[PDB]
């Protein structure tokens, strides 16, 4: 029941598609970050606490 | 050898020419006594062979291949009784042809004395797995998967249908018998190092090779129960028979050439054994496993010495045995929660406890605990290797290690812990399954009483 | 195990026996139903001393979230019925 | 563990669970219970003296050199109760736990034993599935608008209704299931 | 003054030692907030999903 | 601090539930249908299928099935010792050289 | 016809019929744990008749009954070896399990799946007997990884418990890192002596080279739980008592001694591994003994002392005195699975509570438990004339009479000391002072069951040592003649380790209190062992295996080159292929362009 919008998807660089990619995460946009964007295909992935 | 193979082309008309609701009762059936007559060529010689005729002759590394092959059938047919209920009688019909025509081409392919038939008929097993992937897989990937699943496979086997057609130029013949027996050495030069290549990369893809494994992940996760267990028990073995085969043209050669690929494997195994260790996916962990074991079996005909070879028969048995349980018991959760997603369903055990002690068995055997066959093909393989070099030990022992970390992190990730709350449609096992699991695991078992049917030629 | 099947007459007088082993609350005045703030004047350091008492003696842990809002003897017994999982 | 949590802690609360934990830790590392008693009154006056200040940042200051001085001293190996997460055995009895939903997939053999409890359990259902229509109304109507703040539940109002979302906290399999 | 704990990658600063819970503002406290709303209301659409007698299936989770 | 009267309601309501259920997890005096169908003695008995028997399967494959081949079952070829003699010669092994004993 | 064979044979053969009913009308009964306990007891009592024969001549045997696999020159058969080493430890070992079955009956009544659980009891036990009298190496590899399947089963024994599986996994991975020298040795043997049976092993290796014997030793030092590899043991306490008696107490964890002790020919011929052998041994007997008189956890406590004592069992393989380590081993067995007796007894009088400072005073109220736990602890430290002193006072006066390390003598005798500190903090904390559990009590010795399954090793504890001494025949030259102060040094250091630990413990009842030392935390936290080496490596490891492996090669690279890097090159050349407008203009300056080329190049 998953549409394509709700998909990870490539580095944010706008704070527009920074916001959206926030709001598909379910959290906060101030809260919201991405990985760094390097060679690594972490794309649109929130770098949650490395907390266990 | 036509008395198994004549059978084999008969189950298509009885399968065309039955009742709507008769299909699998029939096709089983038929299977199983097939199997049952297949069972005698187990009887083989000290000296040469079972030369039946020109065309079809039997070995003792021939003999277990075929003995498993007629066995996958049944079983293939009773994993797939389920998940094709809700289509047509002609659509059933079409799969269990499907299926038919890949056991008559293995059948034909194990025993083919021709090197040049046997590269027909394992081209020809490609159209069969290659048609069951693409029609009754159902994730949108299962064609990307099919595409892989074909080039490679033709990119390797292109070339060496070049290569045999020139021997045969040179030799006059490219039967096995006059090619064992008139056998000369190959000369270090770069048209035969070009030759030996040519011989031996169609087979090293299919393996797979450690680089050359992309294929496999997605052709067994996309694949229908009955296309995955095809292909990780039977599939996988005609790298291994037909380097087996073609190995006797290739000396002193091989010394030379077999440096890059033992590196690759002794490399590859350490890599894909932790690859397991990080896998959402039940069905990419028991393939990158499938990968593992295959490269340990690539080490041993590489190093092609009498341990060696019995070894990777012996493992190539357990293996295909125990992977196909694997994605079987795979697949009877999967039916259940329609997701392949390890961590999703949880603490199974509690819920279904015969079901889990098959999960216990088949990662026993995974994990090549003694006195299983497994363990018997990893051991040969093991002590050939340290013979051949004392510091292939560390490789081997690390993989060893990781082999039962991850076999046992995939029983207690999804076997152990808590139930998940909100999955309330986790229904008893079915007949069908049980049966299906000791119908796999009891053949393992059983043959640990009598080694010497599966260790090959050289025992 | 051997432990017998502890009841809710159990819970409440051994809930209200260590409450008068308690020399800051007079045991006559004590009652279920006695506030700990307001009908007996203690301060919250004395309730959570009152918790691990009650822990201490019953022999496991309340979290601290559901120990800070237990006010009264009866709702501290319900609340020992109910982690117990106590019929009668 | 019932009660749910809030956006944040107050001071006061913060102040009276380290109060709980330097308890429990000093009652770890003094193992007879009148030394115990002893230093634990004198623990409950080294919090008293303090009791009355009123300077906010006098008390922020305060509770963090307390609690820098509660993880110096902390007896990395404290007391824990046999059933609490830390304990010897906390989750020992989570594999005898089956759901209630289970029961559904029972053979008619089965259930011939035992009908009394069925019988029940289909009065329990019933109950149920009328229960839910009435639920799910009362929420709609009882949420805020834009969603929930706190997960927090409201009680039953009306005679016949049932406290919304009851089911999975009624028909919890026991504490001790086997 | 006691000695100084000094946090690791596979040791890390506790709860009670970070700084910045004792630095509070009316932003951190709406933040706070703010989480607790989102918490709460993935928490309630799981459990009406959850508690529903009709459902007889897997509840799909978008995160996983 | 405390309890709101919200909660107390509820977790009044939900005790109330809770305990009616577990009230119902009881069983009658007939709960367990059982459906029936069929179609030193204890210790001797014991010691018969559980002790002679297989000592009886064991002794007679290892006496006239393993003992058949050569080298199945080998000893220890048992010590000998002065002033012995021997079932099969009877020779006597002669004594050792007198050492002097004092103390 | 001799019955030597028949009944050493008998013995395993019966151990297995339970095995055999598990899928009978008994298994699904109430009466399935006291079938299998009886079956055990019957076990032992006809074991006890290939004793009395060896112990009154000396029979040894050889049985090669059944032949498996032959491998061209190399024949793998079924062979059992049933010399002094065999013949002692079986009824030892099976009058352990007798007791551990007898306790678990009260232990683990109220657990829906006991009958499941003495089904698995039985099962390790035939796995240890088919490694305690193996000929070959694959029987006794068997063997080997039988028994840790059965300690990996056992020890997650409660499933819906992460650490319970936690613990069993890291169970799983140590052994493994000792099965690589376990695979290792076998490996070199085969390619070397061109067999794996013990006879032609010995026949063959006059003087045995360093990879065999290092490789024995590694396997060795994983089972039984050596400094490098020491961890799982006390992480195995998750499971029940009954199983940390019975396993990880007195007969599994012995099993790498055991190796090590059937591969004694070879070592004797070895120098350098006698040392590493003689210098593992020490620190894990020191550190052990060291992590020990500091724990809460009284089975934490009991299992540091097992651990202490497999270290003195390998100082005395290193010292080249094999015998002595396997009569340790047969004493061990019965004083340490008594003190386990004790303890679990402790643990359910007090409602599943397992720190001594919630245990007060018990030498009045359950006095059984104390009569046997300080006899278990007097045989334990090493009382004279009692079940451990005649191994370990044989153990203290062979290692000060060698030619050794310094450094592992001093370690040795800090050990023995610090066992006796450990026994008295055991006592002292849970026996000695007032109450300190929760008021209900619910203290209860009265059930025939445990008493007479205690007090079956309580009996053993006191006399088994004298018996077996007085019954073996001798097998090394003893040391006669001692310096007076030299002979007198284990009574010496032990009632040393008493006196300052005593003394210590009474400082607890002071009015006074202060913060730890740097000492004290290293000892508690297992010298910081358990905590960076469970965090550094896995971590480490499981990263790489995602983000190197995983992604950066599988996922990307490789997929760049050989797939991607086609596909783009062909959907390129499509394009420019592809890719004229239709103009026939271009089309045929191409052609005059092709046909002109084409007759100047060829000629
Ligand atoms: C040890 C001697 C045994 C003698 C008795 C004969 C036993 C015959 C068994 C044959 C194989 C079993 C079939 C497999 C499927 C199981 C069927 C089932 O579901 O059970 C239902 C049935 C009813 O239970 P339930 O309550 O309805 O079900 C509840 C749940 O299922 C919960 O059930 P659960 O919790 O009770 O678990 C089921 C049980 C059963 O499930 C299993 O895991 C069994 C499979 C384990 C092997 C894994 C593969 C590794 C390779 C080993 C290959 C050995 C095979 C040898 C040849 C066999 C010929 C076919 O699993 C276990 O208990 C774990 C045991 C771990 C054993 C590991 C040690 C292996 C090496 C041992 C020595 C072998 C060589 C000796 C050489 C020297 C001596 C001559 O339970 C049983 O009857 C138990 C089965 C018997 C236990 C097997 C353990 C040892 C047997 C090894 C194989 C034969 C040894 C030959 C040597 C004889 C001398
Ligand atoms: C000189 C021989 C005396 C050994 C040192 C005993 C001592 O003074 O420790 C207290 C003292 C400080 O104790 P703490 O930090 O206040 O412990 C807090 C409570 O006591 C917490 O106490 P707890 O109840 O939690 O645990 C008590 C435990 C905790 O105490 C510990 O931390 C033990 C760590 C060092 C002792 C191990 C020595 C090896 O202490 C003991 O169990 C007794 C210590 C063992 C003494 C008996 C055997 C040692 C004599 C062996 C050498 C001399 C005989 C030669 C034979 C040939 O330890 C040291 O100052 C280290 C001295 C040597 C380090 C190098
Ligand atoms: C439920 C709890 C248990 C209850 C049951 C208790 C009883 C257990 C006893 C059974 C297991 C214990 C092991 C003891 C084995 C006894 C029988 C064994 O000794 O016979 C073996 C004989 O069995 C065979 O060797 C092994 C069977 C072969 C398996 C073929 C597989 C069946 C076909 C299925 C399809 C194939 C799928 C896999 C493709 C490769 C080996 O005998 P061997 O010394 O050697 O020679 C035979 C006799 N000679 C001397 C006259 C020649
Ligand atoms: C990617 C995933 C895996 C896919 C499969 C990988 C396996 C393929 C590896 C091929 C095996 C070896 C190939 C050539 C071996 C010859 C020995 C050579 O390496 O050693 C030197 C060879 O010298 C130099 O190599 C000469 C050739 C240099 C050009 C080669 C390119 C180097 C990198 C290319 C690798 C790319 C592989 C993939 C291609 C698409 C010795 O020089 P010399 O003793 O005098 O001559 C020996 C040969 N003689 C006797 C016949 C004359
Ligand atoms: C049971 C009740 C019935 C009682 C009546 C029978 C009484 C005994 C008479 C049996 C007849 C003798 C017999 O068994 O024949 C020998 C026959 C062996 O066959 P052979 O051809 O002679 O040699 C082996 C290689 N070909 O012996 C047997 O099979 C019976 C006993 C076999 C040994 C027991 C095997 C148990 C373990 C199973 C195998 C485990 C895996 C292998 C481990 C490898 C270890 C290195
Ligand atoms: C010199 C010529 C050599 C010819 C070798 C041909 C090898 C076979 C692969 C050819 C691929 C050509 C097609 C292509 O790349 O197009 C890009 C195409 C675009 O998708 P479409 O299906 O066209 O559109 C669907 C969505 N609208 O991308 C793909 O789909 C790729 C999927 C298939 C990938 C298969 C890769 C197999 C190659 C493995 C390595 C070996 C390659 C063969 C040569 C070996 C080296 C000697
Ligand atoms: C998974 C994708 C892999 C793709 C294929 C990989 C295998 C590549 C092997 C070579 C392919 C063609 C080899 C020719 C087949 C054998 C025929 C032969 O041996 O005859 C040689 C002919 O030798 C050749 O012509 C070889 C030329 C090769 C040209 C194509 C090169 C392909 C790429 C080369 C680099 C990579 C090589 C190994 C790649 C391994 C796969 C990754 C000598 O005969 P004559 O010349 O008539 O007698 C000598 C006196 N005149
Ligand atoms: C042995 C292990 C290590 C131990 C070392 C730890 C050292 C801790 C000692 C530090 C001293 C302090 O108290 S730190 C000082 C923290 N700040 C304040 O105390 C200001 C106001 N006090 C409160 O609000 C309290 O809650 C109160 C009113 C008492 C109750 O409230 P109730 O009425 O709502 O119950």
Same mark, same amino acid.
């Given at each position: 029941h998953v549409t394509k919008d709700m998909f990870p998807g490539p580095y944010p660089k706008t704070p527009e598609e920074r916001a959206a990619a926030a709001k598909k995460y379910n959290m906060r946009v101030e809260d919201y970050e991405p990985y760094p964007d390097d060679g690594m295909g972490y794309g649109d992935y929130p770098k949650l606490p490395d907390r266990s | 050898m036509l008395k198994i193979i004549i059978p084999t082309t008969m189950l298509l008309p009885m399968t065309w020419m039955s009742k709507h609701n008769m299909i699998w009762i029939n096709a089983t059936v038929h299977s199983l006594l097939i199997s049952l007559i297949s069972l005698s060529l187990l009887n083989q010689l000290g000296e040469n062979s079972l030369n039946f005729s020109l065309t079809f002759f039997s070995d003792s590394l021939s003999a277990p291949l075929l003995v498993l092959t007629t066995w996958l059938l049944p079983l293939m047919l009773m994993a797939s009784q389920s998940h094709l209920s809700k289509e047509t009688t002609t659509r059933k019909k079409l799969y269990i042809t499907m299926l038919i025509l890949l056991q008559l081409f293995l059948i034909m392919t194990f025993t083919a004395t021709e090197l040049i038939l046997f590269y027909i008929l394992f081209e020809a097993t490609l159209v069969p797995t290659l048609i069951?992937?693409?029609?009754?897989?159902?994730?949108?990937?299962?064609?990307?998967?099919?595409? =892989?699943?074909?080039? +490679?496979?033709?990119?390797?086997?292109?070339?060496?249908?070049?290569?045999?057609?020139?021997?045969?130029?040179?030799?006059?013949?490219?039967?096995?018998?006059?090619?064992?027996?008139?056998?000369?050495?190959?000369?270090?030069?770069?048209?035969?190092?070009?030759?030996?290549?040519?011989?031996?990369?169609?087979?090293?893809?299919?393996?797979?090779? =450690?680089?050359?494994?992309?294929? !496999?992940?997605?052709?067994?996760?996309?694949?229908?129960?009955?296309? *995955?267990?095809?292909?990780?028990?039977?599939?996988?073995?005609?790298?291994? +028979?037909?380097?087996?085969?073609?190995?006797?043209?290739?000396?002193? !050669?091989?010394? =030379?050439?077999?440096?890059?690929?033992?590196?690759?494997?002794?490399?590859?195994?350490?890599?894909?054994? *932790?690859?397991?260790?990080?896998?959402?996916? !039940?069905?990419?962990?028991?393939?990158?496993?499938?990968?593992?074991?295959?490269?340990?079996?690539?080490?041993?005909?590489?190093?092609?010495?009498?341990? *060696?070879?019995?070894?990777?028969?012996?493992?190539?048995?357990?293996?295909?045995?125990?992977?196909?349980?694997?994605?079987?018991?795979?697949?009877?959760? =999967?039916?259940?929660?329609?997701?392949?997603?390890?961590?999703?369903?949880?603490?199974?055990?509690?819920?279904?406890?015969?079901?889990?002690?098959?999960?216990?068995?088949?990662? !026993?055997?995974?994990?090549?605990?003694?006195?299983?066959?497994?363990?018997?093909?990893?051991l040969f393989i093991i002590t050939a290797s340290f013979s051949w070099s004392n510091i292939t030990i560390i490789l081997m022992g690390m993989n060893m290690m990781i082999t039962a970390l991850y076999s046992l992190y995939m029983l207690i990730t999804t076997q152990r812990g808590k139930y998940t709350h909100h999955i309330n449609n986790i229904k008893p096992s079915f007949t069908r399954e049980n049966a299906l699991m000791a119908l796999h695991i009891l053949p393992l078992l059983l043959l640990t009483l009598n080694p010497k049917m599966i260790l090959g030629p050289l025992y | 195990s051997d432990a017998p099947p502890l009841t809710l007459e159990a819970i409440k007088d051994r809930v209200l026996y260590v409450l008068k082993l308690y020399d800051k609350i007079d045991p006559e005045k004590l009652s279920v139903n006695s506030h700990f703030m307001k009908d007996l004047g203690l301060d919250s350091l004395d309730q959570v001393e009152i918790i691990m008492a009650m822990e201490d003696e019953f022999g496991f842990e309340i979290p601290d979230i559901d120990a800070e809002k237990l006010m009264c003897p009866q709702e501290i017994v319900d609340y020992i019925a109910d982690k117990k999982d106590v019929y009668e | 563990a019932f009660s749910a949590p809030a956006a944040y802690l107050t001071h006061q609360q913060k102040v009276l669970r380290l109060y709980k934990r330097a308890l429990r830790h000093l009652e770890s590392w003094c193992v007879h219970r009148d030394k115990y008693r002893y230093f634990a009154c004198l623990m409950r006056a080294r919090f008293d003296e303090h009791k009355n200040e009123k300077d906010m940042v006098k008390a922020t200051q305060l509770l963090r050199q307390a609690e820098e001085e509660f993880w110096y001293g902390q007896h990395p190996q404290p007391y824990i109760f046999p059933e609490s997460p830390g304990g010897t055995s906390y989750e020992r009895y989570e594999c005898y736990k089956v759901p209630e939903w289970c029961l559904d997939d029972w053979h008619p053999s089965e259930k011939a034993m035992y009908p009394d409890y069925f019988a029940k359990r289909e009065q329990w259902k019933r109950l149920r599935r009328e229960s839910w229509e009435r639920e799910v109304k009362q929420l709609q109507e009882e949420t805020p608008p834009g969603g929930p703040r706190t997960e927090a539940l409201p009680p039953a109002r009306k005679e016949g209704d049932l406290p919304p979302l009851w089911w999975h906290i009624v028909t919890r399999p026991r504490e001790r299931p086997m | 003054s006691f000695p100084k704990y000094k946090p690791s990658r596979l040791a890390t600063l506790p709860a009670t030692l970070d700084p910045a819970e004792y630095d509070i503002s009316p932003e951190t406290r709406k933040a706070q907030a703010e989480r607790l709303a989102i918490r709460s209301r993935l928490k309630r659409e799981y459990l009406l999903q959850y508690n529903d007698p009709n459902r007889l299936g897997v509840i799909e989770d978008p995160a996983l | 601090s405390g309890y709101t009267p919200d909660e107390k309601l509820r977790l009044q309501q939900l005790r109330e539930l809770r305990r009616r259920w577990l009230k119902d997890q009881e069983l009658s005096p007939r709960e367990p249908v059982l459906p029936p169908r069929r179609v030193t003695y204890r210790h001797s008995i014991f010691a018969v299928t559980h002790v002679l028997i297989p000592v009886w399967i064991i002794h007679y494959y290892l006496k006239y099935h393993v003992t058949a081949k050569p080298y199945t079952v080998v000893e220890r070829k048992p010590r000998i010792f002065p002033g012995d003699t021997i079932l099969e010669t009877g020779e006597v092994i002669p004594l050792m050289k007198e050492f002097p004993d004092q103390h | 016809?001799?019955?030597?064979?028949?009944?050493?044979?008998?013995?395993?053969?019966?151990?297995?019929?339970?095995?055999? #009913?598990?899928?009978?009308?008994?298994?699904?009964?109430?009466?399935?744990?006291?079938?299998?306990?009886?079956?055990?007891?019957?076990?032992?009592?006809?074991?006890?008749?290939?004793?009395?024969?060896?112990?009154?001549?000396?029979?040894?045997?050889?049985?090669?009954?059944?032949?498996?696999?032959?491998?061209?020159?190399?024949?793998?058969?079924?062979? %059992?070896?049933?010399?002094?080493?065999?013949?002692?430890?079986?009824?030892?070992?099976?009058?352990?399990?007798?007791?551990?079955?007898?306790?678990?009956?009260?232990?683990?009544?109220?657990?829906?799946?006991?009958?499941?659980?003495?089904?698995?009891?039985?099962?390790?036990?035939?796995?240890? &007997?088919?490694?305690?009298t193996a000929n070959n190496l694959f029987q006794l590899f068997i063997g080997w990884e039988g028994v840790g399947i059965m300690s990996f089963l056992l020890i997650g024994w409660w499933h819906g418990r992460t650490d319970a599986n936690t613990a069993a996994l890291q169970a799983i991975l140590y052994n493994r890192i000792g099965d690589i020298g376990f695979v290792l040795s076998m490996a070199w043997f085969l390619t070397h002596s061109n067999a794996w049976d013990l006879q032609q092993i010995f026949m063959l290796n006059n003087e045995c080279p360093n990879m065999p014997l290092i490789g024995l030793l590694l396997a060795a030092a994983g089972k039984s739980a050596?400094?490098?590899?020491?961890?799982?043991?006390?992480?195995?306490?998750?499971?029940?008592?009954?199983?940390?008696?019975?396993?990880?107490?007195?007969?599994?964890?012995?099993?790498?001694? %055991?190796?090590? /002790?059937?591969?004694?020919?070879?070592?004797?011929?070895?120098?350098?591994?006698?040392?590493?052998? @003689?210098?593992?041994?020490?620190?894990?007997?020191?550190?052990?003994?060291?992590?020990? /008189?500091?724990?809460?956890?009284?089975?934490?406590?009991?299992?540091?002392?097992?651990?202490?004592?497999?270290?003195?069992? &390998?100082?005395?393989?290193? /010292?080249?005195?094999?015998?002595?380590?396997?009569?340790? $081993?047969?004493?061990?067995?019965?004083?340490?699975?008594?003190?386990? #007796?004790?303890?679990?007894?402790?643990?359910?009088?007090?409602?599943?509570?397992?720190?001594?400072?919630?245990?007060?005073?018990?030498?009045?109220?359950?006095?059984?438990?104390?009569?046997?736990? $300080?006899?278990?602890?007097?045989?334990?430290?090493?009382?004279?004339?009692?079940?451990?002193?005649?191994?370990?006072?044989?153990?203290?006066?062979?290692?000060?009479?060698?030619?050794?390390?310094?450094?592992?003598?001093?370690?040795?005798?800090?050990?023995?000391? @610090?066992?006796?500190?450990?026994?008295?903090?055991?006592?002292?904390?849970?026996?000695?002072?007032?109450?300190?559990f929760p008021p209900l009590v619910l203290i209860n010795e009265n059930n025939p069951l445990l008493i007479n399954s205690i007090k079956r090793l309580l009996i053993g504890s006191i006399f088994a040592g004298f018996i077996i001494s007085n019954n073996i025949p001798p097998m090394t030259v003893p040391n006669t003649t001692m310096p007076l102060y030299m002979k007198m040094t284990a009574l010496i250091v032990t009632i040393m380790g008493f006196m300052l630990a005593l003394e210590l413990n009474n400082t607890t009842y002071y009015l006074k209190f202060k913060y730890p030392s740097q000492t004290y935390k290293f000892s508690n936290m297992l010298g910081y062992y358990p905590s960076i080496m469970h965090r550094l490596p896995t971590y480490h490891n499981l990263s790489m295996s995602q983000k190197s492996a995983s992604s950066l090669l599988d996922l990307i690279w490789l997929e760049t080159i050989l797939p991607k890097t086609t596909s783009f090159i062909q959907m390129?050349?499509? $394009?420019?292929?592809?890719?004229?407008?239709?103009?026939?203009?271009?089309?045929?300056?191409?052609?005059?362009?092709?046909?002109?080329?084409?007759?100047?190049?060829?000629?």
């Open positions: - | 069951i992937i693409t029609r009754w897989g159902n994730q949108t990937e299962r064609l990307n998967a099919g595409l =892989y699943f074909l080039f +490679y496979t033709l990119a390797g086997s292109l070339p060496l249908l070049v290569a045999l057609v020139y021997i045969q130029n040179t030799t006059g013949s490219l039967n096995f018998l006059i090619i064992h027996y008139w056998s000369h050495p190959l000369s270090n030069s770069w048209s035969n190092i070009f030759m030996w290549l040519a011989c031996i990369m169609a087979f090293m893809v299919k393996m797979p090779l =450690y680089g050359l494994h992309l294929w !496999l992940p997605k052709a067994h996760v996309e694949a229908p129960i009955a296309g *995955s267990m095809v292909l990780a028990a039977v599939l996988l073995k005609l790298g291994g +028979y037909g380097m087996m085969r073609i190995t006797t043209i290739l000396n002193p !050669l091989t010394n =030379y050439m077999a440096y890059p690929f033992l590196m690759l494997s002794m490399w590859g195994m350490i890599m894909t054994s *932790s690859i397991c260790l990080r896998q959402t996916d !039940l069905k990419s962990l028991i393939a990158y496993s499938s990968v593992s074991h295959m490269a340990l079996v690539i080490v041993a005909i590489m190093i092609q010495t009498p341990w *060696s070879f019995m070894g990777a028969t012996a493992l190539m048995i357990a293996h295909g045995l125990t992977s196909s349980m694997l994605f079987c018991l795979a697949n009877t959760n =999967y039916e259940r929660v329609h997701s392949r997603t390890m961590i999703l369903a949880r603490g199974l055990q509690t819920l279904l406890p015969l079901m889990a002690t098959w999960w216990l068995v088949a990662s !026993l055997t995974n994990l090549a605990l003694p006195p299983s066959i497994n363990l018997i093909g990893e | - | - | - | - | 016809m001799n019955p030597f064979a028949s009944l050493t044979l008998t013995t395993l053969t019966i151990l297995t019929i339970p095995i055999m #009913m598990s899928n009978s009308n008994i298994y699904k009964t109430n009466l399935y744990p006291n079938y299998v306990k009886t079956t055990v007891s019957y076990a032992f009592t006809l074991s006890l008749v290939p004793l009395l024969m060896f112990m009154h001549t000396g029979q040894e045997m050889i049985i090669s009954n059944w032949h498996w696999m032959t491998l061209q020159t190399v024949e793998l058969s079924l062979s %059992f070896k049933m010399d002094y080493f065999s013949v002692m430890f079986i009824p030892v070992a099976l009058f352990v399990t007798w007791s551990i079955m007898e306790f678990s009956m009260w232990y683990m009544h109220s657990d829906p799946f006991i009958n499941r659980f003495f089904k698995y009891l039985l099962l390790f036990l035939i796995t240890m &007997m088919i490694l305690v050596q400094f490098g590899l020491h961890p799982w043991l006390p992480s195995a306490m998750e499971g029940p008592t009954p199983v940390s008696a019975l396993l990880h107490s007195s007969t599994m964890v012995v099993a790498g001694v %055991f190796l090590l /002790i059937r591969f004694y020919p070879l070592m004797e011929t070895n120098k350098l591994v006698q040392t590493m052998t @003689l210098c593992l041994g020490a620190i894990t007997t020191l550190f052990t003994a060291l992590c020990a /008189i500091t724990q809460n956890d009284i089975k934490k406590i009991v299992a540091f002392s097992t651990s202490s004592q497999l270290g003195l069992m &390998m100082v005395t393989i290193g /010292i080249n005195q094999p015998h002595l380590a396997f009569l340790h $081993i047969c004493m061990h067995a019965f004083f340490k699975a008594m003190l386990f #007796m004790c303890s679990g007894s402790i643990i359910h009088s007090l409602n599943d509570e397992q720190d001594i400072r919630k245990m007060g005073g018990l030498y009045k109220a359950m006095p059984f438990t104390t009569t046997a736990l $300080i006899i278990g602890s007097l045989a334990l430290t090493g009382m004279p004339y009692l079940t451990g002193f005649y191994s370990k006072d044989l153990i203290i006066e062979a290692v000060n009479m060698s030619y050794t390390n310094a450094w592992a003598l001093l370690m040795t005798l800090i050990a023995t000391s @610090l066992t006796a500190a450990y026994s008295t903090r055991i006592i002292f904390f849970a026996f000695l002072g007032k109450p300190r390129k050349m499509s $394009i420019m292929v592809s890719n004229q407008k239709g103009l026939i203009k271009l089309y045929f300056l191409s052609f005059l362009i092709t046909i002109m080329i084409s007759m100047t190049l060829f000629n």
